[PDB]
Amino acid sequence: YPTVSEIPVGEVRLYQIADGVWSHIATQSFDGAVYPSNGLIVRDGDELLLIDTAWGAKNTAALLAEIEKQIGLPVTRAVSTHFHDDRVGGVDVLRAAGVATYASPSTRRLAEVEGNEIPTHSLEGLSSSGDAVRFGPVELFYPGAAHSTDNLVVYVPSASVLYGGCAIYELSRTSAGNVADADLAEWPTSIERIQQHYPEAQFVIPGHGLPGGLDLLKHTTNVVKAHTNR
Numbered sequence: 683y684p685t686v687s688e689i690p691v692g693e694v695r696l697y698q699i700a701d702g703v704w705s706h707i708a709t710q711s712f713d714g715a716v717y718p719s720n721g722l723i724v725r726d727g728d729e730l731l732l733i734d735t736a737w738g739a740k741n742t743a744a745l746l747a748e749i750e751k752q753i754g755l756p757v758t759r760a761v762s763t764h765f766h767d768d769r770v771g772g773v774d775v776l777r778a779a780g781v782a783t784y785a786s787p788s789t790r791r792l793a794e795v796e797g798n799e800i801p802t803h804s805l806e807g808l809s810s811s812g813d814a815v816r817f818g819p820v821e822l823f824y825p826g827a828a829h830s831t832d833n834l835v836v837y838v839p840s841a842s843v844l845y846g847g848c849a850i851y852e853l854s855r856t857s858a859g860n861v862a863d864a865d866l867a868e869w870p871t872s873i874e875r876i877q878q879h880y881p882e883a884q885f886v887i888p889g890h891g892l893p894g895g896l897d898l899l900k901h902t903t904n905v906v907k908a909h910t911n912r
């Protein structure tokens with residue numbers, strides 16, 4: 683799996699998780715350091731559903747070019763899973779490319795307040811923790827507040843792929859990361875809802891770093907709780 687040192691900023695890599703399911707991986711500078719960042723691509727017949735931008739206008743253009751090169755099906759819809767720039771930065775590129783962009787009303791509001799790019803369409807039915815709605819070939823799930831108050835997770839039932847987004851940490855992380863927008867007290871409860879709702883997930887994809895299995899869920903709870911204790 684690609685690492686930050688192996689991906690120059692501005693390039694995007696794709697990685698088959700399972701049939702018709704890819705992650706996309708990019709790198710971006712934030713406050714003077716470079717970080718890797720993941721999203722998801724899910725085949726939707728002869729179209730593609732995109733989960734999250736590649737963290738910036740130029741990265742997201744590179745994302746679309748790499749999808750066209752490697753997959754060759756059009757991206758028709760995109761869902762952003764919270765309001766931070768690594769999720770919505772590039773939405774303007776997507777919209778101009780003909781992609782219909784979606785996010786919860788919470789994400790759209792927070793993005794606007796923050797001065798970030800704003801998905802066009804509002805995803806209703808996800809404002810209460812435990813809410814689940816169908817969106818093409820995936821289920822969208824609001825687990826409750828965690829990394830941010832608006833963070834969504836995405837399940838691909840055909841492939842048993844659980845995309846946790848930035849509410850889920852990779853196994854190599856032992857300290858909490860950026861908690862500025864987080865709800866540390868609710869984060870374990872939110873993970874518990876994910877665990878109970880998707881107990882058959884075979885692959886778990888964090889928002890940043892290496893994918894793994896279901897242990898990424900308990901691992902994230904461990905890290906968040908240890909931060910709170912300490």
Ligand SMILES: C=CC[C@H]1c2cccc(C(=O)O)c2C(=O)N1c1cccc(OC)c1
Binds near residue numbers: 712768861862
């Ligand atoms: C700050 C690091 C960049 C990225 C990242 C990489 C690796 C781990 C994490 C983490 O969850 O701590 C993050 C994270 O939060 N990011 C982020 C991206 C855009 C806006 C933002 O504002 C709060 C934060």
Ligand SMILES: [Zn+2]
Binds near residue numbers: 764766829830848
């Ligand atoms: Zn974030």
Ligand SMILES: [Zn+2]
Binds near residue numbers: 890
């Ligand atoms: Zn993130």
